[PDB]
Amino acid sequence: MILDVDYITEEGKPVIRLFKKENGKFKIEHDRTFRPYIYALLRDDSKIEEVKKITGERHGKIVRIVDVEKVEKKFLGKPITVWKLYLEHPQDVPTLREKVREHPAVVDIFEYDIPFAKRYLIDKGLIPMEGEEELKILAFDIETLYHEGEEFGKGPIIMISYADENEARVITWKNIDLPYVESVSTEKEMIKRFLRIIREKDPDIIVTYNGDSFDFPYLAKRAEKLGIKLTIGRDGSEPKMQRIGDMTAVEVKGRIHFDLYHVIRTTINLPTYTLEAVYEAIFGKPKEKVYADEIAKAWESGENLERVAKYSMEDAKATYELGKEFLPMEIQLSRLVGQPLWDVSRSSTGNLVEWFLLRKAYERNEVAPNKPSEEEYQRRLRESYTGGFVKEPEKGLWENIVYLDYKSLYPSIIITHNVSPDTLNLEGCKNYDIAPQVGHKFCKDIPGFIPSLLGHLLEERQKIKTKMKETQDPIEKILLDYRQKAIKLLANSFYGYYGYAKARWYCKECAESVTAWGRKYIELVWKELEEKFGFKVLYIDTDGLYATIPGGESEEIKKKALEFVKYINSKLPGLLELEYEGFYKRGFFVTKKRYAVIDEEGKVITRGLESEIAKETQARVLETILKHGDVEEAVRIVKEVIQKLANYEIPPEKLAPHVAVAKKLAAKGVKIKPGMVIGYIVDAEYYIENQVLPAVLRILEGFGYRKEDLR
Ligand SMILES: [Mn+2]
Ligand SMILES: [Mn+2]
C-alpha cells in the first residue's frame, strides 16, 4: 500500500520517496530516474534548436533547460504536437517557464504548475491507499486553561487524551481516581507519555479534529518552551506546518495526519460543526459543551475535574469514532483521484475533480488546459451563471401527494448530450444536439472528454450497487457501499465544476446548457403528467416535483403514478430518468423553498419553515394541519394565544436583551466574555408580534389569512 509521496533534494537533485505500507512492513522507496517538465506549443518545430538555450538563475546558481525531445498529444480532442522540455529540479520550473511563453516561437506552454510528487503518481499511474492492509488508527485531543487573556500557549496543557480500538485514555498531571486516567508528575511527563504512546502504538493514520489549527500547533508552542522535541513522525521528527488553501496544515512524516474537521464540513450541510454538533447528527446520542469551567484546575483546584476528565476521554472517543466513519469516504476519494489522503482530505470537492481530470488526461494522452490567469479568473467571479427551476406552488392543503425524482439529472444530461467544452460548437461536426434555450451546440461524432469519463463513473457505480445486492460478506458490503458513495459524490460535482472559477476545464456554456436542458425535461414531465395522466402538479424543484389528482382516491394515485413513470421514461432520451420517490399523506407548499408534508407513518419533513411560546405554538399549528387536516382548529389555536398573552396567563417558563443581563451575574466573579456558557432568560406587542405571529405567520400566508383578525 501507499501512503504518501514527497521528494527530498540530494544536492541540486530531486528525489521521490514513497511511504509504502507492506505486509506488516513499513517503508521507503526513493526513486531517482524521474524528472520535472512542461510542454511548449510551437510555431515551427524547426525552432527547437533556438528554444533550448534558455537560461535561468536560481538560488545564486544557474538553472537551465535539460533534455528536450518532441512529442504528439491531443488538446480538447484535436491532435496536436508539442515540445516536452524537461528539467532538473521542480524548482527550476517557476524560473524557466516565463522565459518560455515569452519566446516568439512559442504559442503556449502547458502543465507548468503541477506539484512534482503529484505529477509523479499521475505519470507513473500509482494510486494511494490501494491495498487492504489494516491501518492503525489513533486519535487524540488536548485540553488547556484559557488564561485571563489571549496568547495561545501560555495556558498549559491540562490534559491529553487519546483513543482507538481497545481503549481511550487521558493522560494528566493531577490526581483523579479514574480507571482510565493516568496521572504523571508534570506537564513535561504528560507530553512524554503521549510521545511514548504514539511509539508503542505506532499509528499509520493519526486522527484529530481541528488538530491542524489547534491540537498540533498548541503542542508545539508549548514545547518550543519546555525543552522537548515533538518526536512524532516515524523518522523521529516533529510535526511540520505546510501551505495549502490559504489556511495552514500539518503533515507528520511516515504517518497521515487526517484532521476530521475539514472533511465533515462537506457531506452533511450543518448549522455549526462543533464536535458535539457533528457527533449528534451522524449517530444520534448527545454530548456536553461550552467551557472555561476548567476551574477544576485553576486555583480552585476543586474536583469536578472528575467531570472534565470524562469530557476529554470524550473529545477523543468521539473524534476516533467519526474518523473511522468519515475515513473510508476519503480513502475512496483518494483512490479514485490517485493522490494522497493528507492532501485529498484537505481540498474542496471542486478540486478533487480537477485532480480527477489531470489524471484521466494523462491516461488518455490529452494536455491539460491551464488554470485561469488572475484576469480570466477575475471575470468568472462574475456571477449569475443560471440554475433551473424553482416556479411557485399550487397553494393549499393537499392530500395523497406523490413525489417524483430524476435519477441524477445533471450527470445524466452531460452524458446524454455529450456536453463538454471540447464538443462545444466544434467546427464542422456532422451529428449534434442543441441546448434548449441558448442554442449552444454539442457535437456527437465522438464521446466528449468529461462525458465518457462520467459515463464510466456512472457505469461502475451500477456494478457496485448491483454486486452489493448479491453479497453476504458484510465486510465486502460496507466497503462496496463506500466505493459507490464516493463515485457518487464525485459524479455529482461535475456540474459545479464547469462553473468553477479555477476549473482548468471551465466552460460556462457547458454549465448553461445542462441547466437549461434541465428545464426542458422537467417541463415535459410536467406537461405529460398533467395532460396524458390527469394529475394536478403541485410544485416543481430542480430535480423533481409533487403531484396528485385532487380529491383522488389514494392507492390509485400511487398506482397511476407508478404507471406514468414507465410511460415517460420511454419518452425521455438517453439516460434521463424519473423515479417514484415517496408518498405523503398531506402537505402544502407555501412558496419557493418553504413547504411541509407527513408520510403514511406520521413523519414530518419540512424545509423552509421551523422562544418557546412560538416553538410550542408553531407546532400545535403544524400538528392540526398535517396530522388532523384542520386549518380552523389551528387559527382556533393562534387565537386562544394571541389571547393568553393580552390576557397575561402563561407560565414565565417558555420565554428564555443581549448584554443586558451581565447586569447582575457581575456579582459572581462572572467575568463573562463572548465565549462562556449562558442559557439566560429575558412587551405584549412582542410575544404576540415580534414573536408568535411571524412564526405561525409564514405557514399561514399559505392560506391567505393575515396578521389582522388573527390578533
Ligand atoms: Mn503527501
Ligand atoms: Mn478539546
From Swiss-Prot:
Family: Belongs to the DNA polymerase type-B family.
Enzymatic reactions: DNA(n) + a 2'-deoxyribonucleoside 5'-triphosphate = DNA(n+1) + diphosphate
Top-level EC class: transferase
InterPro entries: DNA-dir_DNA_pol_B (IPR006172), DNA-dir_DNA_pol_B_CS (IPR017964), DNA-dir_DNA_pol_B_exonuc (IPR006133), DNA-dir_DNA_pol_B_multi_dom (IPR006134), DNA/RNA_pol_sf (IPR043502), DNA_pol_B_thumb (IPR042087), DNA_pol_palm_dom_sf (IPR023211), DNA_pol_type-B (IPR050240)
GO molecular function terms listed in the Swiss-Prot or TrEMBL record: DNA binding; DNA-directed DNA polymerase activity; endonuclease activity; nucleotide binding
Applied uses, from the record: Because Pfu DNA polymerase exhibits the lowest error rate of any thermostable DNA polymerase studied, it is routinely used for PCR. It is sold by a number of companies including Promega, Stratagene and ThermoScientific. Various mutations to improve its abilities have been incorporated.
Quaternary structure and partners: Monomer.
Keyword Transferase: yes
PANTHER family: DNA POLYMERASE CATALYTIC SUBUNIT (PTHR10322), DNA POLYMERASE DELTA CATALYTIC SUBUNIT (PTHR10322:SF23)
The protein, known as: DNA polymerase
Species annotation: Pyrococcus furiosus (strain ATCC 43587 / DSM 3638 / JCM 8422 / Vc1)
Gene3D superfamilies in the record: DNA polymerase family B, C-terminal domain (1.10.132.60), DNA Polymerase, chain B, domain 1 (3.30.342.10), Helix hairpin bin (1.10.287.690), Palm domain of DNA polymerase (3.90.1600.10), Ribonuclease H-like superfamily/Ribonuclease H (3.30.420.10)
Keyword set includes Hydrolase: yes
One BP term from GO: DNA-templated DNA replication
